[PDB]
Design a protein around this ligand. Structure first.
Ligand SMILES: O=C1N=c2cc([N+](=O)[O-])c([N+](=O)[O-])cc2=NC1=O
Ligand SMILES: O=C1N=c2cc([N+](=O)[O-])c([N+](=O)[O-])cc2=NC1=O
Lengths: 258, 259
């Protein structure tokens, strides 16, 4: 009766303990989603086993084979019973799996190295000396691409035609690029990550301006799962008890390095 | 007929009476955020609808003694409406009796003060008495402080609960009025979405200070086992990704602002 919980290895959501070599099972892991999982399980009344998604991805659908990868794939194909991770609620994903109500809110934000004369998305669109880009894939990119707003359309026009490329392969790459471009590059990513990195050494970056949109992380379960109901109520219950905020503050600031 | 009966509440700027509403008939009588949203939801879900205002003008609370729901939530659980399109906060007790779509707007408890008031945060209110402060005498707001584990807020609750004269108001407008009349000696805690709306209305003597003390969400509600929920749920998500929700937000909040 053990529930197979799939999740991704992303800080501070899911991380490896300092001594994960001497540990075994769920005790190996720690972090926001790891703590959350314990709560969700306690209120829904079930035993769970935490497993890291094989390909270490969230969930996208190939345009050719139409196959789902990442944690979404593990849910649609019967490899996992529930996904507890920072998985953003989207239209296409909602069509194939069931999402609970958001346990965390977020949106596209701007990351820059401290000292950079940038304060908003508008500031970027008006200049070029300070290059800026996003992940070469994901909701963040397609946001600007399918945006009928001139500010984001102009930013998109720039990003689309730039030399060298302002797009990055991974997030860690984008963050590093900001730290290494000596204040000549700005990275557009999820606010949750932006404000987490801002609290990590060497603490040479900061979040600027407000969010460009509004997304949400949700606990996903296979379409039609009987588990979805209880889990959904658990999230709402945890939120109304300020537990989600407590968990946030904990892994973002209490364990912060600034 | 196959005309979806849409229940909604009369709260600005979500649903408001037009200019010549007396000369108009049907849905064309109303306007606002939720009115525009309803049109889109119906467009993508493909259905004709009729806008109706909830009789008791309430959102949805379960009377503790009669165990009976009121407002829009009640209209659903008792088969009087097919769908509820309004600023209805997604709560636990409600999710237990109705089906909510994914949030179409995020919000949280915020502090409303009269401009000039020497307050910048909730912690400020808790370290003083010079400036009185309160909330609606019912709802998730007053509920947030009573069951709070944060010291400042539990210190605020201790103050509010035992304060004379009472610092609790009966309506939203009543709380806003008290702020505009207390010459900056009264702060009002309410939904941020409403706080940032009043901040855009005459005479523009109020403002929102500090960040939200929590995080809620407005969602479209439908009765359980409704053949409408899933479609409505996908509609909200798509509208958000197309930036339509943000456009509606900016239209009725800032484009028609007065400050
Ligand atoms: O569901 C998703 N959740 C994500 C969460 C994060 N995150 O910041 O937690 C990131 N990211 O780091 O770029 C990308 C994501 N891509 C997704 O498709
Ligand atoms: O579900 C609710 N939704 C609300 C929405 C608003 N609003 O701001 O739209 C307010 N308010 O104005 O105080 C109170 C509410 N109380 C509720 O119980």
């Amino acid at each position: 009766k053990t529930v197979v919980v799939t999740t991704i290895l992303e800080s501070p959501y899911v991380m490896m303990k300092k001594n994960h070599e001497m540990l075994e099972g769920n005790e190996r892991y720690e972090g926001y989603c790891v703590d959350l999982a314990a709560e969700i399980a306690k209120h829904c009344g079930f035993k769970y086993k935490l497993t890291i998604v094989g390909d270490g991805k969230y969930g996208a659908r190939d345009a050719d084979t139409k196959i789902w990868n990442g944690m979404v794939g593990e849910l649609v194909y019967g490899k996992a019973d529930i996904a507890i991770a920072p998985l953003t609620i989207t239209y296409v994903r909602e069509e194939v799996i069931d999402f609970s109500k958001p346990f965390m809110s977020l949106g596209i934000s701007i990351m820059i190295k401290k000292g950079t004369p940038i304060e908003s998305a508008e500031d970027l669109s008006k200049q070029t000396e300070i290059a800026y880009g996003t992940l070469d894939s994901g909701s963040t990119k397609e946001f600007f691409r399918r945006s009928k707003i001139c500010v984001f359309d102009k930013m998109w026009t720039y990003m689309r035609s730039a030399e060298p490329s302002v797009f990055v392969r991974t997030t860690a790459e984008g963050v590093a690029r900001v730290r290494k471009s000596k204040g000549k590059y700005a990275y557009l990513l999820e606010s949750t990550m932006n404000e987490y990195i801002e609290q990590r050494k060497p603490c040479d970056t900061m979040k600027v301006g407000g969010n460009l949109d509004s997304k949400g992380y949700g606990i996903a379960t296979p379409k039609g799962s009987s588990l979805g109901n209880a889990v959904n109520l658990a999230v709402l219950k945890l939120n109304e008890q300020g537990l989600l905020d407590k968990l946030k503050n904990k892994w973002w600031y209490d364990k912060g390095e600034c």
